[PDB]
Design a protein around this ligand. Structure first.
Ligand SMILES: [Mg+2]
Ligand SMILES: [Mg+2]
Ligand SMILES: [Mg+2]
Lengths: 255, 255, 255
């Protein structure tokens, strides 16, 4: 076929879609020689979600020329929980397709499950949105980021992020009280993956909608770490990196 | 109580009502397990305004069974400017209520302000009016839409909208002269939120009353973007999307 | 100059960078009185790469005080294939440099090639990550390790390593079938360098991403042997030893 994109772990594609599905209905997947880009805005038209999966993330990848797969994510995710986790998953399609074929292959025995999913026609033009320089760049465990966001969103729909020298501060003020989380750059010798990194070019003081942050943290499924890039000028970028790809969320400050 | 619908930002409900109040006197709010729908027609009986706020727009939401709140918007908006902006706001009511309780809670200190607003009895049957397919769908910054409408309404009470391939054209002819605004689909790399999207299934050539467009643009308060859906057959739909909801305006072409 | 670090074989520094360049974009080289440490994480933020080159690896070494050289590896490797292999290579820099000078000297005739490479500003804090004790330590030919990894990665993105008494077992289960490699500690009398050594303090059963293992094996360029240290508690350590240095990869198990 024209496109044959083989994930060795179907669970990888399931975790990708879990990064999207709770805040996006429709997603266009543009498949190219160098891999797959998907983009979608959330129902409120405030959050841009951008996925890039390069050729090397796949066991085998072939796509001579572009193919656009407009998919309903509620449909795709009834079917994406059809792997075994252990299954491989190949996305298969032809030119200007009307359906996408999801081919699950068992990695224990002799079983194939071929699904054909009806595609939808979607606009669709894409934003490659990341700036050349940001005011501050940081990274931390995505489980730590998720907890901070879940915790403070209990208090307020607005979470203020402040970056100062060697200081990252999240703050929310609610009717039952207030929360302030201060994290400092820290390299963990025993478990480096839990480190916190900060590069500050200038201080940042920006407020974000917690309801959007609660969508963003579902990228946790893809990466144990999250990179955050902040700018007084441009939307904030929240990035969950895969092996040969990433899931990006762009979000303007509230003010 | 039977209904307890907690906005974490009272300003959110104020901005919702600001979308309505200048063209609608009376509004029935139907509260359900999945959130709130309000509907009203303007005094001239030409513009239908439809609001839907889902459960997730609220910090906390409970409504076992339907509750209908007929409110005078001039009254509701003397009281809706009683929050601090920083206040939370819970709408509270019981079965077949005669009043609605607006409970504002301070997010800095220990203060509660409980208002009880007398309700009015209103008909009231609701139209879920959006079609399955439209001729053309587009979205743009609501501030850009507002400016175009404010600018051209200075010239004429009729604004013609024409959709052709990759072209959106607004036109007005007045006694002091004429205006033509042409916008083209454009994805902005640095500030995606300012992008213009167009999906044309067939060309459109429709004229609308500028006085109604000037009511519609007050939805600007709720969303930085506006979706517009146009049809030779059905009313035009102008849509301002919230986090877990929307404000919709339906408007027939003038001819 | 402040730093003058002379490799007698430019090919040595080329082989070092080949250990990094396919999984890391940017690398900070910290130069000190006792030699050079470089550290970088891969694009997915899962693999930590740590290089240490001591003074004795160099024909001549001088560096009174720290110097940090942030280098783009794609740039450094267009230039690092500028030696003849037979050339010596001196890295030269001054205090808080903006460029690094690579001075290649011919070991046959009278020729010097001086390159000046623009440096990049990088965070950069470093993890000295190795634990005091691991559950199991082993070493084997790096070409044997590479083959096992290349072979099993054809089958699966997950390679399970199990250590039991006098037994090292690598296993992968794929859609076309499964592979199990069992190696046993063995001292080779004729070619000791090909021996396999195992020290087991407790049994190990850990699964690793094959895509990361495929990055790690490129350390083959530096050493004919690889040491592996495994722990139920800490990341796995894969180590390629030079004369007076090493290249280390730290990698958490998949589960
Ligand atoms: Mg598997
Ligand atoms: Mg607040
Ligand atoms: Mg030589």
């Amino acid at each position: 076929h024209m496109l044959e994109a083989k994930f060795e772990e179907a669970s990888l594609f399931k975790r990708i879609i879990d990064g999207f599905k709770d805040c996006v209905q429709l997603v266009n997947f543009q498949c190219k020689e160098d891999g797959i880009i998907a983009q979608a805005v959330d129902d409120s038209r405030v959050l841009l979600v951008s996925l890039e999966i390069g050729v090397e993330a796949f066991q085998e990848y072939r796509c001579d020329h572009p193919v656009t797969l407009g998919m309903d994510l509620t449909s795709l995710s009834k079917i994406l929980r059809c792997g075994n986790n252990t299954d491989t998953l190949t996305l298969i399609a032809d030119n200007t397709p009307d359906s996408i074929i999801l081919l699950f292959e068992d990695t224990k025995k002799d079983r194939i499950a071929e699904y054909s999913l009806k595609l939808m026609d979607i606009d669709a033009d894409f934003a490659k949105a990341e700036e050349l320089q940001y005011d501050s760049t940081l990274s931390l465990p995505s489980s730590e980021f998720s907890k901070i966001v879940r915790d403070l969103s209990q208090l307020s729909d607005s979470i203020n992020i402040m970056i100062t020298k060697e200081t990252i501060k999240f703050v929310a003020d609610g009717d039952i009280g207030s929360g302030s989380v201060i994290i400092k750059p820290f390299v963990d010798m025993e478990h480096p993956e839990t480190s916190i990194k900060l590069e500050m070019d200038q201080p940042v003081d920006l407020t974000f909608g917690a309801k959007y942050l609660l969508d963003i943290i579902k990228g946790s499924s893809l990466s144990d770490r999250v990179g955050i890039r902040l700018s007084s000028e441009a939307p904030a970028l929240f990035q969950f990196d895969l092996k040969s790809g990433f899931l990006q969320f762009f979000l303007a400050p509230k003010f």
